[PDB]
């Protein structure tokens, strides 16, 4: 499982988006019998929290998920070639750390809950 | 919950595929206050790992999941009547233990990631 882990860390975002399963499979597994257990418990919570995010968004069970949130040029004005072909995910995460929680809120609030309510109303027509 | 657990272990695979929820519901729950806790933690990890497999495949949230991996006669030449009507899951698992990781790799690599990328590209047409 470990093999290939973080190998595309220095690759472009496009090239590094085809190895998502390699990172995904590496997120899940005498006081030293307690502390290690705590670490195991910690890993589970982190995994579940990320999965919870994917579930409050319409992204449950997916590694690549398309959404209805428009991109804002304030978050980033770079082209697609300057993000996917000429840029790595670490650089992108360093720039967009500043805006992550606005995008997360837009993902959580407007799009998924309005889409879910609209499916609730279309299903009773 | 426990009632009916593994009851279809000796039944045919077809008959035993209608009781999947009975097994699914039984997977989730002083040094003896630590060891038991470790066991509980262990159960969670196992559950999550299986769920993780189902998520890296296109099978999240399903107990029966159809895929795009063709069956290979090298894995098994038996008919459908000799698998579903005249055979149990333990016998099937004993034969196909030898081939499980090839099927798992084909499930993980070609079909789900190519399908996910193709949906990523169809959604922008």
């Amino acid at each position: 499982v470990f093999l290939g882990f973080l190998g595309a860390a220095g690759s472009t975002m496009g090239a590094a988006s085809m190895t998502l399963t390699v990172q995904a499979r590496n997120l899940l597994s005498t006081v030293w019998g307690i502390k290690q257990l705590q670490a195991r418990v910690l890993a589970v919570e982190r995994y579940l929290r990320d999965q919870q995010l994917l579930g409050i968004w319409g992204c449950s069970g997916k590694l690549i998920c398309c959404t209805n949130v428009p991109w804002n040029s304030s978050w980033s004005n770079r082209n697609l070639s300057e993000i996917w072909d000429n840029m790595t995910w670490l650089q992108w995460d360093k720039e967009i750390s500043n805006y992550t929680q606005i995008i997360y809120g837009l993902l959580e609030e407007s799009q998924n809950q309005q889409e879910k309510n609209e499916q609730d109303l279309l299903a009773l027509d | 919950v426990f009632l009916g657990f593994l009851g279809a272990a000796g039944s045919t695979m077809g008959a035993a595929s209608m009781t999947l929820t009975v097994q699914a519901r039984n997977l989730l729950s002083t040094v003896w206050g630590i060891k038991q806790l470790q066991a509980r933690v262990l159960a969670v990890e196992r559950y999550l790992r299986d769920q993780q497999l189902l998520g890296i495949w296109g099978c999240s949230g399903k107990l029966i999941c159809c895929t795009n991996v063709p069956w290979n006669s090298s894995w098994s030449n038996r008919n459908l009547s000799e698998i579903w009507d005249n055979m149990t899951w333990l016998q099937w698992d004993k034969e196909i233990s030898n081939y499980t990781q090839i099927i798992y790799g084909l499930l993980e690599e070609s079909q789900n990631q190519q399908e996910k990328n193709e949906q990523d590209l169809l959604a922008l047409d």
Partner: antibody
């Protein structure tokens, strides 16, 4: 530099099964989507089929949807079109071209950028 | 299919505006109208894409524009070497992709 060169073109009868092959050079073949577009001798251009950069998504016009089959090999840089049950309306110069779509991670390429010499097909 | 004038004419140094009319589902729904120039005996060449955008190597004399459900190709500075059949291409959705118009005979 982009050189598209079609072959396999000739003459066939109704019900024929004709295979064309377009060889590409001068650019990254696997990075671009490809299309086949046809021109009847006395008419204008008609789009026939589209295949994406990975060769997994194929699109056809209704008139050929169940008869034509676009395909690609990215190691050999070869685009191919297999037409079965050829009809009298399929007589045309067929051209292979680069473009028609792109993946979500690229800019839109809803146009045919580069073109081939063409290949005459008489049913 | 798109409706396009069968032929136009213009004297050298003058400017012509080939037109192109489509339904609202294609020209009036997507801003993806491209223009191709085909000389007799050769294959088309992308003069314009995305309504107003020119491939590199293409002279500035060729320009495009849209108006509702109509597109146009303004060819200024007409030269003898512009004598070609011009074609429209509009993107028309996912159930159908590319619709071409008829050819326009340009004479000088």
């Amino acid at each position: 530099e982009v050189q598209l060169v079609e072959t396999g073109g000739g003459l066939v009868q109704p019900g024929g099964s004709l295979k064309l092959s377009c060889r590409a050079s001068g650019y990254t073949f696997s990075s671009f989507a490809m299309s086949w577009v046809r021109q009847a001798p006395g008419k204008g251009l008609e789009w026939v089929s589209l295949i994406n950069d990975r060769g997994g998504l194929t699109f056809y016009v209704d008139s050929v949807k169940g008869r034509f089959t676009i395909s690609r090999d990215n190691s050999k840089n070869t685009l191919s079109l297999q037409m079965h049950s050829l009809r009298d309306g399929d007589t045309a110069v067929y051209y292979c071209a680069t473009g028609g779509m792109s993946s979500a991670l690229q800019s839109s390429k809803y146009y045919f950028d580069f073109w081939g010499q063409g290949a005459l097909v008489t049913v | 299919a798109l409706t396009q004038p069968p032929s136009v004419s213009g004297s050298p140094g003058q400017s012509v505006t080939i037109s192109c009319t489509g339904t609202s589902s294609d020209i009036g729904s997507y801003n993806y109208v491209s223009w191709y120039q085909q000389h007799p005996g050769k294959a088309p060449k992308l003069m314009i894409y995305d309504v107003t955008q020119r491939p590199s190597g293409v002279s500035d004399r060729f320009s495009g524009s849209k108006s509702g459900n109509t597109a146009s190709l303004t060819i200024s500075g007409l030269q003898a070497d512009d004598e070609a059949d011009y074609y429209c291409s509009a993107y028309a959705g996912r159930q159908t992709f590319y619709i071409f118009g008829g050819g326009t005979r340009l004479t000088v």
